[PDB]
Subunit: 497 residues, 4 copies
């Protein structure tokens, strides 16, 4: 059998010639017998004094923690990021100090709308989260398999998610909600085009590209700042599953990606992703035709070529899934000195949203979980006691700042980069911005004709379930993109009805 | 479209001629605009003073509560239990006072091992939970679609569940774990025979029978006690899905049962289950050939015929799924006067396990959730303040007992029934009890030959993935049941290898 | 006895001629006996099947929720705010529509550093929180008994609190921490002067003034905005306790304020506070000698006289303390249309800090607690399911925005007021701002000589326990305020040593 | 100053010649500046992108965990238990293997009814909790400073506590509740006599005796079982504070015991308690005049002399109070092989109550907190993933039992001791048992006349606040104890009125 199936046999083998450990309670007391309960005779009621049963039963009753609000179903791996090129002129980040520097990384693949225990081979954006354990703390590059997103405003993110998940009353998947939201927000036309293309159902997690998808700010030692876009493309080649084979695998192996990654790491074929950065200057950002901080826009390769940095190699499988994949927390606000946030509104929303949901799902002290600890760094601050504090609580060090007793002091060289922003402080409408140019370019320049037909057929097959007016609005947006797009989609919808 | 698909259209229609409500924050403040965020100019960073965004985003970040440890994926309905026969000679329960008495009931169907968002048409025991809102509080009849269970000792329940769920390291479904546990515990041979039969994959939730599966204690007004077994058989007839059609539906509609129930309730065809009780006396229990409190044993119909009581009709769909299906809590310890627990060890374990996991999953005050409240009863006790107390907290009533100020007093007519139990107080082994007689009876008396072939083929198709020695142990148990059973299973396994 | 002592006797009296209710479990089942447990004979072990005992015991085990991080020890009352003057030219807030409008209010008094169960008569800032139930949601005016605070930067608030609370290792009150922090941050010199004056230990909660202490933004219907400061002065007159009488009451009645308020409300003498506003224009704010948004600065009465608005009357005592005083949540971000936040950094920090700690302490759905609900308003949004959802969950209304089904729509008349802010976006130092002018004015203009002597004696009595260099730094700051201040403090410290 | 006051100075001194650590966020990123926030210019609003501020502020907002339901205010210390006598003939417990064996212990002193932050020198039972880190797990001896308790039935424990704590409506201490409960339950007459005696207010935690107060079961290697009572008397001598000095210290130093213990451990005078056991045989238990498992009864020293075992020495102060004193969990169900529970109903209730409240207050995985871990033992079981799992989660070991892969196996030598119990299974009334004999013996044999006068004066001073009929019931119980007792109490009450 494949190495995934032989987990218990392997665990037994590498534990050969050793006697089985003593079965203990949570407090370390040896268990006399864990196959029968204390009763009043052979046919009597159970007793309270059976501490072993109630202990294990309560621990069983407290096994489930809340699943992630999005990206619940996922797989995990571990490896290293190795620097292969010198970008010190762009960023003073310790992760990019010198050539050959290897930084431990933890990676999680996920599906955005699937719940815990859903099918893996479904048409849905795949999330790629990387946690670098830099000497300057953890760096969480939490990207997607697509260089863009559906919306460009964080205030729309819950609603969008609510449309992608189940109906509030029937608890069923509703194409009506999906396409109503998508047709009322034309800024999705780009990502939908990426979603229903061939790369909407990648073949496993090793045959897909990764995209930080946000503009970031790289700061060098001399204090100059540039804008950046992190890419990391698969060295195993892009490979996608057909709709029919994906539908088959959904019932054959609903855990296709997890098994694929586990077997690829267990048979030695370590997957790898090569790391690139797109770089832009400030005057280039002020002269960009679109908003360079728009999440629905890309930077064309001809104007901004990819600059290699390093490669991402995943060589270790998780020992325990829950302790290392289900409990790992990725915070985009975790950026070491040299990397900073951009005026991208979506990145601004993510700076707040992630630690909040991490304190809800895992707990206030989730950064004490071994997978979330910056174990390759030194934590020292005035943050003190919380629920489930499993450290020294920083001992008897003073817990107020400033003090006069030699407690941790701020490092003035880690100051943020300053930029002057003008204009009034209010809510600026961005729904009426450009929504069709880059979509048209991707449609008539990147895709060939058979890929266009497959894209339109997928879109129509999904959209045929919505109401007639929602279909009309969606096809109107597609026609405003390009007449062939909406024309083919409308013809296929007419054939469906 | 079916009524399930037209949820939003119907909600819009029954709200015709009404203007849309005002969009408010959680605290009721009107929202000026919820489509853009407050930035420093059109391309500026987001501000903290955007209270609307952070409010809705934090509420979105705290949307997921822990799923049920078992029976996560489920559907819900509501209706009434109507008494049609007089069993007052057996139980003084107010739910069974007089003919024609209608008691509101809330029902939840579920799959034992599937997580939230898994396939609905899978081979797995289906759980049927009923909550009666009796004037004497809530009565939770939490049964299965099978009259028995896999094990007979609650101390084995977590382990069993751990074997039925994903591998701890690979997070994959492991037939190795399943069949290792099943072959090391022969007391499963009965329920496995029920699981891999035709009724292992019922066609929706309306074409399956329900079984409290436990022995209960019925007490009359005069104080005499009898043993009972609650059945409730479907009036829509037993109907099951073929393995191929179930595998197809798993990828076609992973929410098959939810949609089926919702449509059946929305088109007027209210499903119904007829309620029966098997009754046994105390001397009959002491002269039973097996343990009458064994969960893996049934009471034969020839010796204990079914006695009709009433019928269960489900007529209302949930308004909101989460508030009424995902948050509903079923506690087998919720028994009104007249119904009591039995020396059945599994019922004893369930008496403790359920409120614990309810306080973990929902919260200490989960009985304040409207679906969990005994709204048709009067709650008055000395239980006081906890997290999320949404009542008057019983006002300024004295919170200690006994007192001298007219606080709630105990009702001496609700005392439990007394029974003397002899024998020493220790752990009694029940793994070596009878495990094959009733299994053989079900195999050679209830099933015909083609059903036997289908049973063996299903068992072999699932077992073929385990190791060779696990297959040998399983087939040895099946052969000890009956030679034809293990013989056919071993032949099919040899064909598979 | 006083009405506070006769709570149970009164509850018994107003329940005369009524039989005691039935003692029930949490699920409404009648309890046969709650004075003995189920045992194996008279001297036997307890049984698991005793559901009543384990139910009440688990509810007892889940009685404590986390105390407030600050302002834990507190008292509560309820009443109405009555408008007596027309300020519609300043704010379009529905709470200030017309003369005679009565809005229900909930008020909580508290001590900032005392834990739950500490002495009430201690030298510490007293917090005054008011929750108005306006038709436009809840308005939380969460002020102090002092018009200023110790610091002016929210990033210093945890540290300050950490210095005011117990030592991290010894768990003792440490004057060393207090005075080290206060001497390293001279911007406290003002509030310390208010803290160690006569009004540092008010006589109960009815003899103290209330101060929102922040600059707010009042917006009229025509769109013009002004800056505001909310005052509300006691109609019972300012009255303070001597140090010796306060020390006596600390051991006599550690719940002095709670009892005082309860008795004053129960004997009919309803306390009242008269509401004033200080108003400032935008050019006045740009020509203010100090920072008008500095929390350590006041607006002089000669340049900005108080403008009466209404009065605050407290007429109802809480029925249950925990359900109405311990679970009430005050969010400064709860501002109806017409009231908005100011560039005051401390108000900006409070806009975020309070809902976070409310979701931690009470739960994600704390706005469903009856005391926290905007019951005089209509809640309608797309915020959905969370832990402990005790509502309809807004039924089957669509949960995404925008939609096409008549769900709640944004009210464009509730838009925020726009202001253009210039300058770069970075951290601006405000520790070196003016720290002694208003302190000197309060010292040599408001206080007389005996009050100055009492202030210096209190400061010295508290400071004498710190180290010598901390005393030197504190007295240096006091001398930089005014030579007499530091001179008297240093003389008293020399006398103490 | 005393060593408690010089905590920060000492921390600075033992860290001399070392530069201050780098101030980091929770994720290890260096903080550029933690004294100012990011604003839009010098007088601009705060930004969301200020991750440092929101991080530390959220961690500050999640600082409070629920206080203990009882025994909230407490102090902690650490040391060793050294065996000095051979009791192997009584118990096979590894803690009592051989002479000179030193086992690490963690000790917590507490006050039963005081909340966190209340006065330490108050009349209230003092709790003494010891956690032994035996090679066979942790042993939690959780006793009091009194050999008995107020009640004898666990179903009365919440109510009692509710009477000892604040009124539900006024949130004030109510002598009415206290004495109503005490007069309605005469079985308190003994412990009340201990409570209002001289030892009701011990002088610190080093001048009080400790009592497990329960009957336990000692089992030897040969399988014979005896009944036991654990005593441990102070080697510093019994010393108590007068009522006036206690009232003074309540306002002088509300943390008297914490400071006393900290200074005694920091100046080298390590306190010590000598360990004794009272032993009883089974026939002696069946011939005892009272119930030997009654918690309100003692074993007379003449019939059951104390047998020395070892001594308890406390030599280490906690490094961080919260991580080692506030988060330490004591579970009476934690008993190593050789020590077992007794038919004492109160011990049966405590076997369940403590892990439940520990999972509520600390979390499901509270046994992973370093102070709660059995670090001197090996934990190996099938208990798996829960909220806040900070271990390997036992790696990829099989999580079901029984299995065929060498996972931890039960140790059949740790089986419990079997005893046959007769009689019916119901609730047996024990309120009408003997309540005055041992009380009379303590009154007229142990106390002298001046101690009797002080006892009566304390009882009257506390009881004078209750209603007249409650006073009559209390004095009636005291008179039924002995005529002089109730006579003096009634005379003092008449003088008070
Ligand atoms: C940066 C500045 C401040 C921050 C971050 C802050 C934070 C907090 C927090 C976390 C609480 C706990 C509330 C709860 O757990 O329910 C609280 C309570 C409170 N604060 Fe502040 N605070 C600040 C300054 C102030 C100011 C300036 C005032 C008054 C002018 C004030 C008055 C109060 C009051 C009265 C309460 C009690 C709330 C209640 O009783 O429900 N605080 N604050």
């Amino acid at each position: 059998r494949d190495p995934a199936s032989d987990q218990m046999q392997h665990w037994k083998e590498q534990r050969a010639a050793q006697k089985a450990d003593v079965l203990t309670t949570g407090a370390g007391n040896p268990v006399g017998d864990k196959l029968n309960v204390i009763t009043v005779g052979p046919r009597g009621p159970l007793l309270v004094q059976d501490v072993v049963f109630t202990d294990e039963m309560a621990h069983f009753d407290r096994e489930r923690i809340p699943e992630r609000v999005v990206h619940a179903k996922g797989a995990g791996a571990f490896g290293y990021f190795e620097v292969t090129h010198d970008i010190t002129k762009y960023s003073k980040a310790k992760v990019f100090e010198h050539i050959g520097k290897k930084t431990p990384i933890a990676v999680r693949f996920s599906t955005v709308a699937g719940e815990s225990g859903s099918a893996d081979t479904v048409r849905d954006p795949r999330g790629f989260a990387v946690k670098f354990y830099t000497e300057d703390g953890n760096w969480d590059l939490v990207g997607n398999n697509t260089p863009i997103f559906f919306i460009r405003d964080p205030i729309l993110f819950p609603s969008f998610i609510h449309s992608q998940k189940r109906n509030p009353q029937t608890h069923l998947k509703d194409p009506d909600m999906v396409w109503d939201f998508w047709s009322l927000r034309p800024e999705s036309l780009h990502q939908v085009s990426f979603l229903f293309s061939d790369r909407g159902i990648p073949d496993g997690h090793r045959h897909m590209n990764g995209y930080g998808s946000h503009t970031f700010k790289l700061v060098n030692a001399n204090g100059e700042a540039v804008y950046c876009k992190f890419h990391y493309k698969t060295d195993q080649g892009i490979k996608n599953l057909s709709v029919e084979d994906a539908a088959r695998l959904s019932q054959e192996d609903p855990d296709y990606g997890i098994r694929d990654l586990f077997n690829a790491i267990a048979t030695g074929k370590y997957p790898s992703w090569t790391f690139y950065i797109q770089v832009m200057t400030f005057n280039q950002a002020e002269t960009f035709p679109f908003n360079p901080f728009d999440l629905t826009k890309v930077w064309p390769h001809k104007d901004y070529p990819l600059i290699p940095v390093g490669k991402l190699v995943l060589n270790r499988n998780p020992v325990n899934y829950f302790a290392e994949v289900e409990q790992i927390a990725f915070d985009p606000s975790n950026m070491p000195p040299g990397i900073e946030a951009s005026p991208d509104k979506m990145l601004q929303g993510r700076l707040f949203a992630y630690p909040d949901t991490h304190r809800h799902r895992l707990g206030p002290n989730y950064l004490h979980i071994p997978v979330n600890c910056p174990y390759r760094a030194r934590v020292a601050n005035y943050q003190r006691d919380g629920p489930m504090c499993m450290q020294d609580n920083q001992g008897g060090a003073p817990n107020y700042y400033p003090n006069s007793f030699g407690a941790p002091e701020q490092q003035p060289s880690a100051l943020e980069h300053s930029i002057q922003y003008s204009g009034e402080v209010r809510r600026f409408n961005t729904a009426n911005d450009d929504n069709v140019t880059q979509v048209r370019a991707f449609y008539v320049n990147v895709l060939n004709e058979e890929q266009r037909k497959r894209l339109c057929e997928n879109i129509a097959g999904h959209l045929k379930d919505a109401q007639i007016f929602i279909q009309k609005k969606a096809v109107k947006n597609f026609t405003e993109v390009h007449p062939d797009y909406g024309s083919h989609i409308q013809a296929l919808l007419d054939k469906y009805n």
